[PDB]
Amino acid sequence: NAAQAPVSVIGLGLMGQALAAAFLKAGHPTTVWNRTAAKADQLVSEGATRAGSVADAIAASPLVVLCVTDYGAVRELLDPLAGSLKGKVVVNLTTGTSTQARETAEWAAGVETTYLDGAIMAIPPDIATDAAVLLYSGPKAAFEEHEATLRALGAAGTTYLDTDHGLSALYDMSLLGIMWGVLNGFLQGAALLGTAKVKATTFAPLANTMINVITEYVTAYAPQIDEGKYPAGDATMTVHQDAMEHLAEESETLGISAEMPRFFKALADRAVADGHADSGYAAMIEQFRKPS
Amino acid sequence: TNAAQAPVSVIGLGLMGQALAAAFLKAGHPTTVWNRTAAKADQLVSEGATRAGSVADAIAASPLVVLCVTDYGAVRELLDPLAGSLKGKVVVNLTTGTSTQARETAEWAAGVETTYLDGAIMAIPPDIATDAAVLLYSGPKAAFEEHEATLRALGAAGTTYLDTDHGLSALYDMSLLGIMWGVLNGFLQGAALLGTAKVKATTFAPLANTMINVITEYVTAYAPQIDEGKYPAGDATMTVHQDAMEHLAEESETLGISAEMPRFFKALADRAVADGHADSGYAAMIEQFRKPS
């Protein structure tokens, strides 16, 4: 039970406030602390306990969640309190780099404390909804002990990765790259359809229907990438390349941007040059691996 | 019982045409077929399709006539000579082409008093007649409604009417392919990045798909902002997007993979910031996609 699983939240910015709110509404006794005291007021009025100091906030709970600007801020808060951390589980949902995650984990074992490094794939209003994804890396046992508590932040999207703490930051970037790819795809299409007086609101649901179809292509292409074998099946790179041609041309003609379609065409042109005219789109992995 | 009463002819039996005729046949339509190279019809004829001897026979055989050939040059070559023969027929042209070709062909069709729908197929042949198939139609609404049930044999869930401008089918086609490449390139970027830490693409795939599903909700929220020209930050400012694109690009260069796409994405964001949209949400990016380059 949640009443038997206390948790402290250190950092009550926009995201930290929503995490504390989620812990509280799921029935955890929730201790909070922020450098700027007034950011706790709304949460205190709703039943959270205001800690007197960072030390108190750590002592209050066996599970300690951090969510501040950067890992500089994290070290500033925790360095002085090494002794205070023994036997606690620290869950750091601050966004940072791979190396920061790994170095912080190293420092934590050094002072005998358990450390998970997380990454939040969500905006504050989506915390505690099925739309929330939250990634955790580090010791599996500590994740299992606190799984039920952590699921208060997003029951469906709470996801353990592996032991390397640095995976959380890598998966974060990788998923954001997908987000920008999807959204830029949609925006290109809205601009094109806009020249024929089609509204983006009219286009959205059909765009989403298509995005859902494409997830099946992701699933089919994945083993091809791992095996290094790129059978055309469906459609050759030559067919993709020709279709990219038409998108670029019709974009230049109708008076909108053609930069992305031309950039996409260039990548395909390189795969053709490397011998993959008759291979399928999975062969494009080779272009994304080539430096600069 | 309905399909037995709804004949359809298919003109063009290439890889895609064969799958369309197969779908019509297995849904119980009496299906007449014709191909220039006559032997490509054998498999379908053996399964119960009628071999039309000529294009004219194929047109006489059915009230609904579907074409699916290489290009609109091929389409005109086949149909021009048969103007008079087409009165009272519905011609459904699922050949891929440009906007202008659709509109010119529709003009020719009214000229010879026939009904003409211009379609585009967003599917591979094996996906025809599955819930994965999307098929787009533009032109007269009444003709689409009359034959909707029959057409749904090609993909019951994804058979979609757009509007009266015949040219819309080709525009929507391109727009959706752009989305496909954006999704797939996003996935490939991520697989290459995770591959440096010995994470397999198959381990990454399910999480990538979970995330793609979440992103559909962002598309839905951004769409009205685009139509209204008002781009409230809500969630995440362009400054936040810009910084995160920075980190993706840097970590990519460091780990020895391509950083061209992340840098290209950053460039577009840099221009939105320069135009004053630091505190706007991602919908403000529509302005960059509308600028001629």
Ligand SMILES: NC(=O)c1ccc[n+]([C@@H]2O[C@H](COP(=O)([O-])OP(=O)(O)OC[C@H]3O[C@@H](n4cnc5c(N)ncnc54)[C@H](OP(=O)(O)O)[C@@H]3O)[C@@H](O)[C@H]2O)c1
């Ligand atoms: N907002 C989102 O949608 C979102 C999504 C995913 C991930 N994240 C990540 O979550 C983390 C927090 O984001 P946010 O949205 O809450 O940012 P924010 O609203 O700007 O708040 C930042 C928090 O860090 C604290 N802080 C900064 N420097 C500090 C220091 N030296 N000592 C003590 N406290 C310090 C702030 O204290 P004061 O309140 O005293 O200034 C505040 O509690 C970031 O790493 C962010 O990238 C955010």
Ligand SMILES: NC(=O)c1ccc[n+]([C@@H]2O[C@H](COP(=O)([O-])OP(=O)(O)OC[C@H]3O[C@@H](n4cnc5c(N)ncnc54)[C@H](OP(=O)(O)O)[C@@H]3O)[C@@H](O)[C@H]2O)c1
């Ligand atoms: N394959 C796909 O995944 C796919 C997906 C979406 C859209 N499409 C579109 O579907 C259309 C057909 O593609 P496909 O994949 O079926 O191509 P295909 O396998 O190359 O077949 C082309 C068809 O067009 C016929 N043809 C070409 N010129 C002709 C002419 N002058 N007179 C009579 N017939 C002619 C061919 O007859 P012969 O057999 O006698 O050559 C054949 O039946 C294309 O516009 C394509 O872009 C295909």
